[PDB]
């Protein structure tokens, strides 16, 4: 049997947090601030994913270039094997040629 | 394990309630019940 026998603990949400209450602020900083910043400079994340999308193969190629030097060994190897697998999949396999 | 099915019970009972008058393991075991309930319909 795979169903809870009791109700789960209640999930109370503050829709008026500082984070929720100030989501989206300064997202028009360029068009409302004489184009001195960009919302892509407002993005906070990994250094290889600030203002760039990519698919998985493009993301793996991009991370190995910006930070493959300062990268742990096992995780670098795994990235090299991942790029090799994704090259073979995206260039040779599929239904549409 | 994000996004798992949490209502599979109610799906199994939606099939199984039409088999409770059958004889044998097909009245309670879903893998045999479905085969016999489609045939009853």
């Amino acid at each position: 049997i795979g169903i809870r026998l009791t109700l789960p603990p209640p999930k109370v949400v503050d829709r008026w947090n500082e984070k929720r209450a100030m989501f989206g602020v300064y997202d028009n900083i360029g068009i409302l601030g004489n184009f001195e910043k960009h919302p892509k400079e407002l993005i906070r994340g990994p250094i290889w994913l600030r203002g760039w999308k990519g698919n998985e193969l493009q993301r793996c190629i991009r991370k190995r270039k910006m930070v493959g030097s300062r990268m742990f060994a096992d995780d670098l190897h795994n990235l090299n094997k991942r790029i090799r697998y994704l090259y073979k999949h995206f260039n040779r396999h599929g239904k549409f040629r | 394990l994000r996004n798992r099915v949490t209502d599979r019970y109610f799906r199994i009972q939606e099939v199984l309630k039409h088999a409770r008058h059958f004889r044998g393991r097909k009245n309670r075991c879903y893998r045999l019940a479905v085969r016999t309930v489609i045939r009853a319909f």
Binding site: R4 | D7, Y9
Partner: peptide, 26 residues
């Protein structure tokens, strides 16, 4: 433990229904 609330709520209403058809109220 699976995430969610809706199936647990449905199962609790099912449990309440069977308890009634088991110990029927006066």
């Amino acid at each position: 433990v699976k995430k969610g609330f809706r199936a647990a709520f449905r199962f609790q209403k099912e449990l309440e229904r069977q308890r009634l058809l088991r110990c029927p109220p006066p």
